[PDB]
Amino acid sequence: RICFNHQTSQPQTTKTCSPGESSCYNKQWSDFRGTIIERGCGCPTVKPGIKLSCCESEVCNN
Amino acid sequence: RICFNHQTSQPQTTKTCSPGESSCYNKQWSDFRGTIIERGCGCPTVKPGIKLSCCESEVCNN
Numbered sequence: 640r641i642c643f644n645h646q647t648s649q650p651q652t653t654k655t656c657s658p659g660e661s662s663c664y665n666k667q668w669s670d671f672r673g674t675i676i677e678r679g680c681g682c683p684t685v686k687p688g689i690k691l692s693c694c695e696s697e698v699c700n701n
Numbered sequence: 702r703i704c705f706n707h708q709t710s711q712p713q714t715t716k717t718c719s720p721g722e723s724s725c726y727n728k729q730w731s732d733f734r735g736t737i738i739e740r741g742c743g744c745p746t747v748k749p750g751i752k753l754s755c756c757e758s759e760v761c762n763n
Contacts, residue, residue, distance in 0.1 A: 660745035690761060699747075 643701050648677045653698060655678035663700035664693045692699065703759050705740045715760060718742035725762035727754045 640662030644654035655691040656663075657680070666677040678700045682693035694700055704725030706716040718725075724744040729752040730737055739761050744755035756762055 640705070690758045692754055692756035692761060694752070696752045699752060699754060 641697050642680045643678045643680060643698050644680070647674070651701070654680050661695050662693045663695075663698070664691060665700040666691050702757075704742045705760055706742070707740060709727050709736070709738045716742055723757050724755045725757075725760070726754070727739070727756075727762040738740065 640656040640660050642656055643651055643654050644699045645652040646695055653681050659665065662680070666683070668675055668688065675679055675698040682691075685691045692700075702718040702722050702725065703715050703716065703719055705713055707714045719742070724742070726739075726741055728739040728743050728747055730750070736743050745753070747753045754762070
């Protein structure tokens with residue numbers, strides 16, 4: 640699986656996930672800097688208030 | 702949890718999920734009409750080839 644791992648609006652970059660991993664995630668929250676977006680492989684746990692989405696296809700997490 | 706449950710580009714509608722449900726899903730595939738998007742509560746299992754994304758916040762699956 641290949642997932643985007645770039646932050647917010649920075650240039651698209653990807654991460655080749657570990658074998659067996661089928662998900663990508665997109666984590667979003669807002670603070671003084673505005674809306675922050677973190678992307679990567681897997682589907683991690685997050686604090687309440689953080690918007691998490693996980694998807695199961697190639698580079699599905701932009 | 703409240704999730705969108707409208708199809709493709711129809712007007713947005715929502716569904717109040719069952720008490721224990723915390724996920725919303727966005728499922729996409731292609732047919733003669735073009736790209737089709739199904740939305741609802743939960744995080745269903747999909748056949749290979751079908752693009753699936755599940756998220757855990759209010760109306761997160763547009």
